[PDB]
Amino acid sequence: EHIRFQRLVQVCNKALEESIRKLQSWEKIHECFPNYGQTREGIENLTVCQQQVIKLWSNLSRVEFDAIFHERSIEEKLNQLDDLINKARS
Amino acid sequence: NLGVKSRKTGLTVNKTVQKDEYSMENLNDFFK
Amino acid sequence: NATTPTMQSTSLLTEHLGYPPISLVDDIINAVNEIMYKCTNAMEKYLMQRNIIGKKDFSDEIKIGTAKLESLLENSVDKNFDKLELYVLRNILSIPSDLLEENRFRLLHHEKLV
Known part of the structure; x- marks a missing residue:
């Protein structure tokens, strides 16, 4: 039921x-x-480059986005919004 | 503006009906 | 629910989120671009201190190669993250008709209080 995040x-x-x-x-x-x-x-x-660049790509982006999702509480805002449209449709 | 116009490239979502499942349109088709 | 953004959604979501929906997209696009250049710069210096193999100097070829890669990500990233900018504002930070046809204002105001 939590599906948007x-x-x-x-x-x-x-x-x-x-x-x-x-x-x-x-x-x-x-x-x-x-x-x-x-x-x-x-x-x-x-x-050595492509294999390390890719790993660097993956890691840097993983750690920032997880941080951005934290500084804006998006997981919760969206979980609040998913379970809130359900209460409205009901 | 924010519906079809990408701020810096303007990529209109002109892929007709897209493909709606699970109450949303699926990524796979959307990103090609 | 897939939907086209509207001003009420932008106005309501801005109030639920505390920030406009686009601000989150800005933090992502801005973030991935910084990574892009951080990777290419890191790759050029790894090669420039390895530009001489045997007795020949490939400095010229590396500068052109590193740059010729960078620009290809500038295009692919700008391409793939504008679709993101669109897929999010239309399917994630999204509004159905059930709520702006008959007062979403009730439940947001209801949320902030009770």
Whole structure:
């Protein structure tokens, strides 16, 4: 019955996953560094970036949004709003 | 303004009926 | 409930939330952009202190590559988070007709008091 906040979490995660997808493709990453990526060490270094950037992307966004959702009490405002339209429809 | 106009790109939700389930329109179709 | 925003919703939700519905969207867009640039900057410096492999210097290629990635997220992020800006204001911070057709004011005023 509390269903709107979980949506907010689903739409945020959904926007982030799509925001980063072109960086999860090793091909487009190599296209930006074609000559550098044709060296062994270059390939090793690029691999360390995309895997760490993605982790950094995920972690930074996870920790701020959880903080933003706290500083604005959105989970509660929305839970109050979900259970309040139900009392009105009843 | 806030109904269809994205402040900095203006992406009209012109995808006709969208797809309503669970009392809301589903993300999957909305984001493509 | 999917719905088009209205001024009453914006006025009522602003009073229930203590802030306009859009303020939350601002905090998100503004936040993800800061992360975007924090990642690219962090990636360019990881490579610039690794710009010389063997005996050749790839500094030029890195600047262009890091920048050429940055701008692609600027477009994809601006794209995917405007849909967010829209999906939220229409489905989350949303109003049905049951409540502005016959006084939502009763229950908000009711909430703040009893």
